[PDB]
Amino acid sequence: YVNDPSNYQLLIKNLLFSPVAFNPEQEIVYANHRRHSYKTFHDRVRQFANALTKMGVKKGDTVAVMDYDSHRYLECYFAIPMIGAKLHMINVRLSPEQILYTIDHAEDDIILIHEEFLPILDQIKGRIDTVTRYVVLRDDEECEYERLLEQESTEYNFPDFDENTVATTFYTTGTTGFPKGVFFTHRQLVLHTMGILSTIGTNASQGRLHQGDIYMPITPMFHVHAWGLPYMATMLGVKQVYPGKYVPDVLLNLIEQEKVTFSHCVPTILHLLLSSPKSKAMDFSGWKVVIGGAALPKALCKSALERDIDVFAGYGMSETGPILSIVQLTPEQLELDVDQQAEYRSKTGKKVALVEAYIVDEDMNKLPHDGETAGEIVVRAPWLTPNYYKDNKNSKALWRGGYLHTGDVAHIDDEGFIKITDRVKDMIKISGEWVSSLELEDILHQHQSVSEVAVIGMPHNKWGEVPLALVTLKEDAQVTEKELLGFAKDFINKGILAREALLLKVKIVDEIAKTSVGKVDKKELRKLHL
Amino acid sequence: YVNDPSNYQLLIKNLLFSPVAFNPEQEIVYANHRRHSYKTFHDRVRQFANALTKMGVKKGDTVAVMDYDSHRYLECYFAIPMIGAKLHMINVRLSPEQILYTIDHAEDDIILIHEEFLPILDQIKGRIDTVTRYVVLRDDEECEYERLLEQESTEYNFPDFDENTVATTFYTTGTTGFPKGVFFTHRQLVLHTMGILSTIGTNASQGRLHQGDIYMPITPMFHVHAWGLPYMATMLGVKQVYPGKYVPDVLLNLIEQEKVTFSHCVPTILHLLLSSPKSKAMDFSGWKVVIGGAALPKALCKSALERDIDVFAGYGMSETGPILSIVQLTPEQLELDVDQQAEYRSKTGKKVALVEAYIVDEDMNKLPHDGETAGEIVVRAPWLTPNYYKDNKNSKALWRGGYLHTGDVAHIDDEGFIKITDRVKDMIKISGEWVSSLELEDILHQHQSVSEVAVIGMPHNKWGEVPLALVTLKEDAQVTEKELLGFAKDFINKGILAREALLLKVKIVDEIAKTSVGKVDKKELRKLHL
Amino acid sequence: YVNDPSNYQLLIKNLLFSPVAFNPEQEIVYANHRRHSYKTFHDRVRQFANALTKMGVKKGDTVAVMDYDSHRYLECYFAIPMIGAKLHMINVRLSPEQILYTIDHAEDDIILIHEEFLPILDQIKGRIDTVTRYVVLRDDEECEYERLLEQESTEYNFPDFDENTVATTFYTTGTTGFPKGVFFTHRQLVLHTMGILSTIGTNASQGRLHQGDIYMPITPMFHVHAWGLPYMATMLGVKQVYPGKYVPDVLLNLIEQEKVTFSHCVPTILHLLLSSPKSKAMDFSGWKVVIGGAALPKALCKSALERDIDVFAGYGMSETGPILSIVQLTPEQLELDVDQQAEYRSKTGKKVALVEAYIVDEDMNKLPHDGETAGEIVVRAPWLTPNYYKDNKNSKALWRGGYLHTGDVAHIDDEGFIKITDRVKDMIKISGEWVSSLELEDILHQHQSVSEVAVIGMPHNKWGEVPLALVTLKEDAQVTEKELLGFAKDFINKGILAREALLLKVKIVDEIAKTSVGKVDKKELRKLHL
Ligand SMILES: CCCCCCCCCC(=O)OP(=O)(O)OC[C@H]1O[C@@H](n2cnc3c(N)ncnc32)[C@H](O)[C@@H]1O
Ligand SMILES: CCCCCCCCCC(=O)OP(=O)(O)OC[C@H]1O[C@@H](n2cnc3c(N)ncnc32)[C@H](O)[C@@H]1O
Ligand SMILES: [C][C][C][C][C][C][C][C][C]/C([O])=O/P([O])(=O)O[C][C]1O[C](N2[C]=NC3=C2N=[C]N=C3[N])[C]([O])[C]1[O]
Ligand SMILES: [Mg+2]
Ligand SMILES: [Mg+2]
Ligand SMILES: [Mg+2]
Structure with missing residues (x-):
């Protein structure tokens, strides 16, 4: 690569080594299994890069991960893209046939698979024929990933390449008959982190993600970069807690004992957390959760607010970064009663920084922004997938009319609150x-x-x-x-x-x-x- | 321009029309002369674009501005770059010969000059020969800029072009014998806004620029985009107060009556504000000021803190965006006494997001980060000027060794606080x-x-x-x-x-x-x- | 396309309109359903081209066919490539899931499906989402293809384009886990026809395909262009008989009543034909059959020879045109007894014109051509697929070492007879x-x-x-x-x-x-x- 020093490239290595804040003694916590500092996190990232280089992973190669939300997953978010390879996040909740299809389509060279997902692999292992090595991940000392990291030094010189190099890829189910692969470059991920960190955190009091927060994702890390929030939390240098396999009791214990203040999950996970017997005696005053992936019920939002939870909704999809809109409340709206606050917090949200959001008809006529007129959301943003991987007609339909078609029907009121009604x-x-x-x-x-x-x-x-x-x-x-x-x-x-x-x-x-x-x-x- | 809709371009029009927040009823205040809403601000931006198009200003042309901090200046920050033209900010405090040199070097086509700067123009008007039209700005109804805007419609379709199109240019004095012109593209300005808004605002409690703030610059708007903060305040949709020509009584009255909470100025202006007789009876508890451009004295910082001012330092130069480092205090440091807090707040600051800061010797050896070892600061950032305009040898010296040479000698302690000692x-x-x-x-x-x-x-x-x-x-x-x-x-x-x-x-x-x-x-x- | 008249392009339209011989009164026979002359065949090809143009099929589009061996299939071999579109031959014998995978992978725009395959389509119709129109083929007057042809004129000006334009594509099962798509250009198909017609037909007496022959394929037309023989028979202007769905009694009746002299089928079909009760009273003296796709048993070859059938073997695969080698007997070998002739005719065969065939080890060392030393066949030919469609690693393995790897282990004797032992x-x-x-x-x-x-x-x-x-x-x-x-x-x-x-x-x-x-x-x- 012809690296011009004055021509800055937006790379994930700049997210890691040039963060908003960096406390070398800040902890990365993987449930009750492992704890290490941010300095150890950087050392492990460099060790993983060395191991991948030893394993023959070059720039442009695809490394697949089948793991729970762990420190290993985060070390994969950085190390694998930061050496020029493509990180393929496999949706472990898909059927084994769909997982096999995604593996064959992406042509992964290395698969990092947790030992609990080995039964899934055994059903499709004979039909892969494209993966040269499997690394089995375990939550104990016998983990192959840990052994691979131990053999490597903590020094690595991460290369400079074009910011348009593809960093992450994953497949969404949708309704296309086969999973469709979307991909994001280093520039797109860096811009997503920057734009959303400019959107949330700059809010006055409500719904902030700031350097004093403690981060715990309850959204799977194979689900659109876990909504891009692990990168944001690393960029802020906050304490990160990773729960592993989701258990409501384990999640609540981690929230209570690690003083978790910022989280994100689908509405079903929030309902499970609030319905757990041990959540009644827990103190939820300092906990902020943002609900995405599905419409947040008003009753669930009201129940969360009655527990003093700063609950607000967000919107996105696998194709769009994902974050397109987040519910941000003005100080006047924070003075409203519980019911009105639940009504406002359950909205699809206002479009985030650098995002153009319009509701259009079948002919793309940009319907007026009334609170009743519903149309399909079409978006332009710095972090949209340009097309579906190795697809043409679905890619053409995705970007029809010069805008990315979300497939969601919504109405946007005068003040800018989107409200999704249903699918197209x-x-x-x-x-x-x-x-x-x-x-x-x-x-x-x-x-x-x-x-x-x-x-x-x-x-x-x-x-x-x-x-x-x-x-x-x-x-x-x-x-x-x-x-x-x-x-x-x-x-x-x-x-x-x-x-x-x-x-x-x-x-x-x-x-x-x-x-x-x-x-x-x-x-x-x-x-x-x- | 071949505009690929999926290929997003980082443009200032995305800063204006896709902000973090947009309240159409939020006010833009120009001292005691004019008030209008953000909707009126956008309408005036489009009217100014129409007027510039009528005046024959095309993409690539240079429009010069000689004005105080006003709503007209902000409308120039957006409109002039957003039509593809280059905004030349003239340092009105330079000598008339230097101003003439900068005008001739940049080859401005249109000059927007305040009527108070007409005596400066009259000394060099005969030797310009490159400007086709002068627009005289006034603080009353007889302003030529206002009359030009009144003749235009409020509708404009801002073009899409390469994000590397030069948006702003200005000349720094330095020690080169002649002023040196630095320039910044749309991409660089958008990235500066995003990175600094990710740096400040995501701080826990101290030194936040957030959507609830009220913004009043006390840094001249020809001085490196007024440190890029007008763009940031517009992107946040906050109430903006512009004081015009700096008078300590007028500044204090605007702070008191407009409830200004965020400001920025050089240490001399802060000293003048604190030494003014009418500042003794004023309430400074909710006012945050960031001090840049020169070293903040510890005594001045302590005096400001004794007035309950959230005062903290920042660092940058005309070549670097400008913002390179901002003082951000951890919650432990906020619990310290007044003297220790003044010591910490007077530092050069920790490097902001996406900035690589190193202290090197004459051979660029990256001296260790001790609190005593001093070397020249060399930086890499997404918002650095690639070279000096129409210059080769000074441009080569600026980027010697693959890093931008700041010319400042500083020591960086273990925790990352920079402290500038003197110039090289x-x-x-x-x-x-x-x-x-x-x-x-x-x-x-x-x-x-x-x-x-x-x-x-x-x-x-x-x-x-x-x-x-x-x-x-x-x-x-x-x-x-x-x-x-x-x-x-x-x-x-x-x-x-x-x-x-x-x-x-x-x-x-x-x-x-x-x-x-x-x-x-x-x-x-x-x-x-x- | 910049068509230089002196720069000749090898196109299938030259196969159709510039044949070796063209008798306008020669018949194309579709079993007992339809008969028409070669002039009518050309008129129907032009009508089909007009219908495809009306249906919106442009150059580069993919038209899929799910049909038996019929006149419609042949009209698809010509018309669809001859307008610049890609002909996708769907293996109707694959599982519905595999057929759906191939349809989605090739992204067919139009599917011509026989009404008997509608039950297969109904299982996967909802998951296609990429086909804009289905044309249902029937063996009666209610066929949609016939109605589409009837609405069009018999005049068409077929375009000139690059000879490297992809003409046909189809998917082979293999052992890759998913079907792999191979494709062939106009140049490759024309060269295949020319080379094999130079190989067979120029033989002295045995195994000739000549202008006086009557052609009836018993190899499915979705199976590697039906071994490229329909093109060859059309190029020779011979009488072509198409049997439709394979029934041994129907096949034997067509052979007897249409005086079929040249055919090709897998060994199982030949065994079924010879074991049919009505084949005992049939005269097989003038019938020549070439056996490919699988090893021809010596007992089956001897039984066919005892019926005076000129039976000889051939070899190829979906990736290789397919024809790579055909058994051609010298006049000395034709004088041998029945057992020796069966031994020679059951060989894999001598490599056809313009084909380089070598047997190599795992390191590609070109093992010596003894009758006992076995190695993997690697080939170079003008009609080899360059890679697998939308695949990289399997494509790289296919052409490892600069030769196409057949995956077949064989020994080649001194005189050039190949004999496949088993797979790699x-x-x-x-x-x-x-x-x-x-x-x-x-x-x-x-x-x-x-x-x-x-x-x-x-x-x-x-x-x-x-x-x-x-x-x-x-x-x-x-x-x-x-x-x-x-x-x-x-x-x-x-x-x-x-x-x-x-x-x-x-x-x-x-x-x-x-x-x-x-x-x-x-x-x-x-x-x-x-
Ligand atoms: C939100 C944070 C805002 C702080 C950014 C302030 C940028 C000021 C740019 C400027 O004054 O530029 P010039 O080229 O005219 O001068 C650059 C030189 O000024 C000195 N400098 C600037 N900031 C300093 C601090 N905080 N402490 C000590 N010296 C400072 C340097 O010599 C620089 O090279
Ligand atoms: C005029 C001469 C016509 C003979 C050409 C026959 C081409 C058949 C292509 C085919 O069956 O392709 P697939 O990819 O489905 O299968 C290819 C594999 O089939 C085996 N094969 C093919 N011909 C063979 C003979 N004559 N003897 C033994 N095995 C044969 C190979 O394993 C091949 O890889
Ligand atoms: C911070 C903020 C965060 C938020 C974001 C989230 C994202 C998610 C993504 C997903 O889920 O994806 P997919 O799988 O592809 O899916 C998509 C879809 O979903 C839905 N959604 C989402 N979100 C939401 C919804 N709905 C309603 N609401 C809300 N919020 C739609 O349909 C889409 O398309
Ligand atoms: Mg989606
Ligand atoms: Mg400077
Ligand atoms: Mg094959």
């Missing part, structure tokens, strides 16, 4: 009046004996589409279609006709098909009804 | 024991009747250099050389011989030569002694 | 004496009650590998391990020890795992034993 694929085309399936699912989710609602929508001769609803019920507490229709009626707002009782046609279904991740697979549900 | 050109070469002139000047500055000290140093046969000192005295309170030598003796530490009484050879001088900026011109002083 | 992956590493698994399988296949033999080989402490054998037996005619060992003993030649009775360790297995194609999947068999 879930739109119910009742003539010209498109309605969201999620609002009807939420309406039906308040029934006396309802368990799960999944509104599909199937073609209709007159209205084009009518919202067919699937409802699962409590055991032995059977509810008929007519009772559900009566309950759904008389609610606020409706489509085209009265309260849509003639179109809802609810059907009781034994089970709802779900993807490997856990979201409802409406594509499979359409097979059973149309 | 001011080094006294007493054999192998180089000593700083500023420490001797400070020692002699505590005399009973001393007024100003300027240690030069002239060649010596035995020791190579010996610290010749020039001392100015109080009127009619004459002090001889021997008395000054006796006072300077018996102080802590010395060079090569006892207390350097045989080498100091103090001489009483009527006046000390100073540059147009106001700093001591030791080059002229050398003419009178060697 | 099937090599038994008994110390330095590697032995072929297929020879042991053939030895054990002569047992009194044996049905299927699959020698795997599992690691051994002393000899590295020992030939573990799996044997399936006739129903209720159980045979023990010791009896099989006794039968296998006393045969000609052996490895390292006596007759390898101490290492064979035969095990009786209920069933042998097989791939979707039908070959033995020794990778799955290794899972059950090591």
Whole structure:
């Protein structure tokens, strides 16, 4: 590489060795297994770089990781990109066939796999044929990664290369039939860290990530760089606690004993943490959690606020860095009551620094920013994937019209708060009046004996589409279609006709098909009804 | 320009239209003359862009500004770069000959000059011959800039171009004989804003610039983008107060009545503000000021702290963005007494995010980071000027060894605090024991009747250099050389011989030569002694 | 495209419109469904080109075909490449998951699928998301392809483009875990036709494909361009008979009534044809069949020769055009008895024109051409795939050492006859004496009650590998391990020890795992034993 010293390159090694703050005695904690200082963390990063160089990993190679949230994962976030290699984060929650597909598609040279994921590997090990070495990670002294690090020196000269070198890659499930690989460069990750650290932390009092915080991720580190927050916490030089495999009791004990103040997780994990018996006696006053990946229920947000938790929502996807918007409350909004604060904190959020967010129709006409007009979110940001890896048509559809298409339908109010209604694929085309399936699912989710609602929508001769609803019920507490229709009626707002009782046609279904991740697979549900 | 939508360009228009926060009703205040909202600010930026397009200003053209800190200056920080033109900030405090040299060297097409600077223009107007139009700025309704803006619409489509397009340029005096022009691109300014906003604001409690702050610059806006802070305040959407021509009473009244919480100025301006009679009855508890451009005296810092001012130091130069290091205090350091806090806050500061700072010798050997070992600061950062404009040899000397040479001699302690001792050109070469002139000047500055000290140093046969000192005295309170030598003796530490009484050879001088900026011109002083 | 008229491009349109011979009244026969002349064939090719242009198919697009051997398939061999599009031949015998993987990987825009394959499509239709239109092919008047052709004119101006434009693509199963896509350009297909037509046809009397022949493929047209023979037959302007879905009675009736003289099929199809009851009364004197895809048994060749069939073997793979070698007999060899002629005709064959064939070791040392020294066949030819589509490491392994690695172990005698022993992956590493698994399988296949033999080989402490054998037996005619060992003993030649009775360790297995194609999947068999 022709390195011009005056031509600065935005590299992850600048995130590590030129941080906002660096305390060499600040601790990196891996649950109850390991503790070491930031100086030891840098030494281990250099040792891992030396080991990767010894293992034959060159610039441009792909190193795959199948591990829980640990210090090893963080050492992989830095070391693997910082030597010019591509870090492939494998979603361990995918099916073994999907994991095999991602491994073959990315063509990983080295796989760092935790010993608990060995049963997954054994199902697909014979069909990989592209990985030259497997390193088995363990939470004890017999870890192969630790032994590899021990043989290496703590000195390494990390190279200078183009900031557009691909640093991380991972595959999102979506609805494409096969996982789609998105990739991010060193420049994109550095800009993501800078922009979000300029967005949060510069807030007045609420929702700050600052140098005095103690960081504990509860979002898997294979899930879009764990929302890019491990890089941010390292850049701030804060104390980082890594819980490993998620157990609610272990998570709560780590929060209590390590004085964790900043965390991030999906709403289900927050619900599990708040519903745990031992969380009742815990002090949550100093704990801040940001909820992303799914819509934060207002009831869950209110319950968290009643525990003095600074809970606020965020939004992003695998293609977008991920962070696109974070809920930031003005001091006037912080003076509101608990219900209004829960309403504001459950929003999709205001767009973060350097992000252009618009809601558009099918023709990309940039719908007006009212609190009721819903359209597809299209974004421009410094940390968007340019395309899907080794894909053309899906890549073209992703960036149609010069904007990245999120596939999410939302309305943005006058003050800039986004509120996601549902997905684009879930739109119910009742003539010209498109309605969201999620609002009807939420309406039906308040029934006396309802368990799960999944509104599909199937073609209709007159209205084009009518919202067919699937409802699962409590055991032995059977509810008929007519009772559900009566309950759904008389609610606020409706489509085209009265309260849509003639179109809802609810059907009781034994089970709802779900993807490997856990979201409802409406594509499979359409097979059973149309 | 071939604009690839997925290839994001770091542009100032993204700073303006994609901020961290944007309150359309937030006010931009120009002292007691004008107030308007952020929406009006954006409308005026677009109107100014339209006017510049009408005036024939194309991409690559240079527009010069000779104005005080005003809303017009901010509208120039955005509009002029955001249309692809180069913003030339003219140092109005330079001599008219130097200003003429800078205007001719930069080849400005349009000059926006305040009516108070017209006497300066009239001395050099006949020798410019390169400016096609002069726009006279006034603080009333007869301002030509306001009339030009009034004729234009509030709609403009700002172009997309390479992020490496030069956005701002200005000339530093230095010691080169002629002013040297440094320039910064859109990418460099955006990265400066992002990095410093990640550095300050993410601090725990002390020295924060956050979205709830009220911003008032007391650093001239032609001085290295006013330290880049107007961009940062606009990016945060905070209330901005612009004082115009600096008057201590006006500044204090603006601080009191506009509830200013964040400011920045040179130490002399802070001393003037604290020494003003009306500052005694003012409440300074909520006011944060960062002191740059010169070393902050410990006594001044202590006096500011005794007024409950969150005062801390920063460091930079025209070539470096400018911000390279800012004093950030850990919570342990905030618990110290007033004297220790003043000692820590008066440091040069810890290097800011994405900045590599090293102290090196004449051979660039990266001296160890002890609290006593002094060397020249060499820096790498995303916001450094690549060279001097239309210069080769000085540009080569600036980036010698692959690092930007600051010309400042400093020691960096173990925890990362930089402490500038003096300039490289001011080094006294007493054999192998180089000593700083500023420490001797400070020692002699505590005399009973001393007024100003300027240690030069002239060649010596035995020791190579010996610290010749020039001392100015109080009127009619004459002090001889021997008395000054006796006072300077018996102080802590010395060079090569006892207390350097045989080498100091103090001489009483009527006046000390100073540059147009106001700093001591030791080059002229050398003419009178060697 | 910058078409220089003097710079001739080797295009398939030159194969069609500049043939060796062109009789406009020569017939193209699709079994008992359709008959039309060569003039009608050209008109239908131009109509199909017009329809594809109307359907939005541009140069570089991929059109997939799921059809039996028909006139429609041939019209696809010409029309789709001749307009600059890529013809994707889908192996309809693969599993639906593999077919879906190939469709997604190739990113087909249009799929021409026979109505009999609609059940396969319905299993994977929801997960394709990349195909814009499906054309359903039928053997009657309601065929969508025929209706599309009827709407178009018979005039088309086929473009001139680079001869290196990719014309055809298809996916081979192999042992890579996922199907690997190979592709061939217009130049490669034209050169394949020219070279093989120079190889066969220029033979003196035996094994000729000449202008007086009548052609009927019994090799699927998705299997490596049906061995490139449809192009050759079209280039010769011979009468072509296409049987559609393979039925032995239909095939024999077509051979008898259409006077078919040249055919090609796998050995299993030839065995089925010869074992059919109605083949006994048929006259096979004028019928020539070339057997490829698998080793031709000597017994089957002798049985075919006893029916006066000019049967000879050929060799190739999906990566190599496919044709690499064809059995061509000298007039002296044609005078030999039936047994010697069967021995010669069952060979892998002599390398065809413009093909470099070598047998090499693991270090690529070009083993000598003796009739006993076995090594891996590595080839250079004008019609080899340069790499696997969207693959790097498998592509690198394919062309390791500057030669295409066939993966087949063979010995080449002094006169140039190749004889494949087994695959490279099937090599038994008994110390330095590697032995072929297929020879042991053939030895054990002569047992009194044996049905299927699959020698795997599992690691051994002393000899590295020992030939573990799996044997399936006739129903209720159980045979023990010791009896099989006794039968296998006393045969000609052996490895390292006596007759390898101490290492064979035969095990009786209920069933042998097989791939979707039908070959033995020794990778799955290794899972059950090591
Ligand atoms: C938020 C933090 C703001 C602090 C940045 C201040 C930048 C000031 C740039 C400036 O004055 O530039 P010039 O080229 O005119 O002068 C550069 C020289 O000024 C001296 N300097 C600057 N800051 C200093 C501190 N904090 N202490 C001691 N000396 C300082 C240096 O000689 C520099 O080379
Ligand atoms: C006019 C002459 C026509 C003969 C060409 C036949 C080409 C068949 C291509 C094929 O079957 O390809 P695949 O990738 O599916 O399989 C390739 C592997 O098949 C085995 N093979 C092919 N021909 C063989 C003969 N004649 N004898 C023994 N084995 C054969 C090889 O393992 C090959 O790698
Ligand atoms: C700090 C801040 C943080 C936040 C961020 C988060 C991110 C996440 C990502 C994910 O999850 O991804 P994927 O897997 O691809 O997915 C995507 C999707 O999801 C959803 N979401 C998200 N987020 C949210 C949602 N919803 C609602 N709400 C919210 N917040 C959508 O659909 C997308 O697309
Ligand atoms: Mg996604
Ligand atoms: Mg300077
Ligand atoms: Mg093959």
